[PDB]
Design an enzyme around this catalytic site. Structure first.
Site, mmCIF file in Angstrom:
data_model
loop_
_atom_site.group_PDB
_atom_site.id
_atom_site.type_symbol
_atom_site.label_atom_id
_atom_site.label_comp_id
_atom_site.label_asym_id
_atom_site.label_seq_id
_atom_site.Cartn_x
_atom_site.Cartn_y
_atom_site.Cartn_z
ATOM 1 N N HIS A 61 0.876 -1.326 0.011
ATOM 2 C CA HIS A 61 0.095 0.002 -0.051
ATOM 3 C C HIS A 61 0.918 1.185 -0.064
ATOM 4 O O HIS A 61 0.235 2.380 -0.340
ATOM 5 C CB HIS A 61 -1.088 -0.152 1.088
ATOM 6 C CG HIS A 61 -0.805 -0.454 2.370
ATOM 7 N ND1 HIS A 61 -0.163 0.576 3.290
ATOM 8 C CD2 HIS A 61 -0.407 -1.550 3.165
ATOM 9 C CE1 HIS A 61 0.103 0.057 4.507
ATOM 10 N NE2 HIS A 61 0.175 -1.142 4.371
ATOM 11 N N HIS A 91 6.757 7.161 5.284
ATOM 12 C CA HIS A 91 6.192 6.639 4.021
ATOM 13 C C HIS A 91 5.099 7.773 3.480
ATOM 14 O O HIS A 91 5.104 8.922 4.152
ATOM 15 C CB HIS A 91 4.947 5.566 4.194
ATOM 16 C CG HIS A 91 3.942 5.863 5.176
ATOM 17 N ND1 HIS A 91 4.030 5.709 6.555
ATOM 18 C CD2 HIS A 91 2.771 6.455 4.914
ATOM 19 C CE1 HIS A 91 2.961 6.291 7.026
ATOM 20 N NE2 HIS A 91 2.215 6.627 6.131
ATOM 21 N N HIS A 93 1.858 8.942 0.703
ATOM 22 C CA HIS A 93 0.797 8.906 0.020
ATOM 23 C C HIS A 93 0.850 9.786 -1.157
ATOM 24 O O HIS A 93 1.073 10.962 -0.984
ATOM 25 C CB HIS A 93 -0.634 9.097 0.679
ATOM 26 C CG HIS A 93 -0.616 8.465 2.089
ATOM 27 N ND1 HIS A 93 -1.346 7.252 2.333
ATOM 28 C CD2 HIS A 93 -0.046 8.724 3.178
ATOM 29 C CE1 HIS A 93 -1.171 6.654 3.599
ATOM 30 N NE2 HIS A 93 -0.359 7.585 4.156
ATOM 31 N N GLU A 103 -3.840 13.463 1.649
ATOM 32 C CA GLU A 103 -4.816 12.748 2.618
ATOM 33 C C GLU A 103 -5.291 13.998 3.210
ATOM 34 O O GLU A 103 -6.597 14.366 2.914
ATOM 35 C CB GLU A 103 -4.305 11.864 3.607
ATOM 36 C CG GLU A 103 -3.611 10.772 2.778
ATOM 37 C CD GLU A 103 -3.673 9.256 3.800
ATOM 38 O OE1 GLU A 103 -3.110 9.183 4.691
ATOM 39 O OE2 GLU A 103 -4.347 8.383 3.237
ATOM 40 N N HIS A 116 4.465 11.257 5.970
ATOM 41 C CA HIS A 116 3.842 10.703 7.004
ATOM 42 C C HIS A 116 5.370 10.224 7.854
ATOM 43 O O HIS A 116 5.561 9.165 7.489
ATOM 44 C CB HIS A 116 3.111 9.848 7.428
ATOM 45 C CG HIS A 116 1.465 10.289 6.684
ATOM 46 N ND1 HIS A 116 0.557 9.504 6.303
ATOM 47 C CD2 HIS A 116 1.269 11.603 6.570
ATOM 48 C CE1 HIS A 116 -0.328 10.385 5.979
ATOM 49 N NE2 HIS A 116 -0.043 11.319 6.309
ATOM 50 N N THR A 195 -4.570 6.509 8.908
ATOM 51 C CA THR A 195 -5.498 6.549 7.614
ATOM 52 C C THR A 195 -5.529 5.584 6.949
ATOM 53 O O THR A 195 -6.292 5.325 5.805
ATOM 54 C CB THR A 195 -4.935 7.746 6.801
ATOM 55 O OG1 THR A 195 -3.678 7.285 6.306
ATOM 56 C CG2 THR A 195 -4.700 9.051 7.574
ATOM 57 N N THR A 196 -4.944 4.282 7.362
ATOM 58 C CA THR A 196 -5.249 3.058 6.623
ATOM 59 C C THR A 196 -5.613 1.912 7.859
ATOM 60 O O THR A 196 -5.372 2.186 8.988
ATOM 61 C CB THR A 196 -3.943 2.416 6.043
ATOM 62 O OG1 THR A 196 -2.922 2.620 7.194
ATOM 63 C CG2 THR A 196 -3.399 3.120 5.104
HETATM 64 O O1 LIG Z 1 -1.053 6.780 7.291
HETATM 65 B B1 LIG Z 1 -0.817 5.500 8.015
HETATM 66 O O2 LIG Z 1 -2.488 5.127 8.399
HETATM 67 O O3 LIG Z 1 -0.355 4.543 7.015
HETATM 68 C C1 LIG Z 1 0.461 3.374 7.763
HETATM 69 C C2 LIG Z 1 0.769 4.178 9.069
HETATM 70 C C3 LIG Z 1 1.554 3.890 10.037
HETATM 71 C C4 LIG Z 1 1.834 4.564 11.192
HETATM 72 C C5 LIG Z 1 1.036 5.520 11.358
HETATM 73 C C6 LIG Z 1 0.032 5.962 10.429
HETATM 74 C C7 LIG Z 1 -0.117 5.454 9.052
HETATM 75 ZN ZN LIG Z 2 0.435 7.488 5.931
#
Ligand SMILES: O[B-]1(O)OCc2ccccc21
Ligand SMILES: [Zn+2]
Length: 257
Positions: A61, A91, A93, A103, A116, A195-196
């Site tokens: 993802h 990571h 998005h 996001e 993020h 957010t996932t």
């Molecule tokens: O943006 B996310 O939901 O994607 C994977 C993740 C990991 C840790 C914190 C927030 C997130």
């Molecule tokens: Zn994220």
């Protein structure tokens, strides 16, 4: 399994993860006119000088750049936070097109991508325990716009060919996440969620006002990744963003006037 397709995307997640319709979901639209300046918020302290990157992983993802979080090497403190939060991974998005990908939105504006930087509260001992707590994570969110290249991003861009498909990893040592920060640390902050899936309501969001600029070529390379595993039909890893969720009974606070 969940994803970002028509049949398994954000509008479906609530069936496996009913918290998708909860009271503190992320992302949200940041209405800049209604965000409240909070003069008691502290400057953020981003202390990344001893950061130890280890590996980069395509998890199907996104891609995660992972850090050694077994000591206080790279930490986030201050701002709205109580205590010390340790960097575990970052990571992004991103979109299929430069007009979408973020996001969070700002006055409904979508950026091309969103970074993020994920940190966990050291009072809970590790990430898995921290995500079960309402103050377990602090995620520093940074918008990406397309324009000039970000020099500090290029090492990431250049390793992506080695992790094209789901489940691939590669060594990724000596990467300095300071090279991904904008000049200003002015921010907005609000309580939210992953957010996932599993969409856990464990995040203090800290979203920087100033975007970083990346080049068209840099974000094009993100879009060559695959959601699929090797030897499966090719599905480009694009539009791996959840849209804005209802703010409900929350206030977004600004660190700046
Ligand atoms: O943006 B996310 O939901 O994607 C994977 C993740 C990991 C840790 C914190 C927030 C997130
Ligand atoms: Zn994220």
């Amino acid at each position: 399994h969940w994803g970002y397709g028509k049949h398994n995307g954000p509008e479906h997640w609530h069936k496996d993860f009913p918290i998708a319709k909860g009271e503190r979901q992320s992302p949200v639209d940041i209405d800049t006119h209604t965000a409240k300046y909070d003069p008691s918020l502290k400057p953020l302290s981003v202390s990344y000088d001893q950061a130890t990157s280890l590996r980069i992983l395509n998890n199907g993802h996104a891609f995660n750049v992972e850090f050694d979080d077994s000591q206080d090497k790279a930490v986030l403190k201050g701002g709205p936070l109580d205590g010390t939060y340790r960097l575990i991974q970052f990571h992004f998005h991103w979109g299929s097109l430069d007009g979408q990908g973020s996001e969070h939105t700002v006055d409904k504006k979508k950026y091309a991508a969103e970074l993020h930087l994920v940190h966990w509260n050291t009072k809970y001992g590790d990430f898995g325990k921290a995500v079960q707590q309402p103050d377990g994570l602090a995620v520093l969110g940074i918008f990406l716009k397309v324009g000039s290249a970000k020099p500090g991003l290029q090492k990431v861009v250049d390793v992506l060919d080695s992790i094209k498909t789901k489940g691939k990893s590669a060594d990724f040592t000596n990467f300095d996440p300071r090279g991904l920060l904008p000049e200003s640390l002015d921010y907005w902050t609000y309580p939210g969620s992953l957010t996932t899936p599993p969409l856990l309501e464990c995040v203090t969001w800290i979203v920087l006002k100033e975007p970083i600029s990346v080049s068209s070529e840099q974000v094009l390379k993100f879009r060559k990744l695959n959601f699929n595993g090797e030897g499966e039909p090719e599905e480009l890893m694009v539009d791996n963003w959840r849209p804005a969720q209802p703010l409900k009974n929350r206030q977004i606070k600004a660190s700046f006037k």
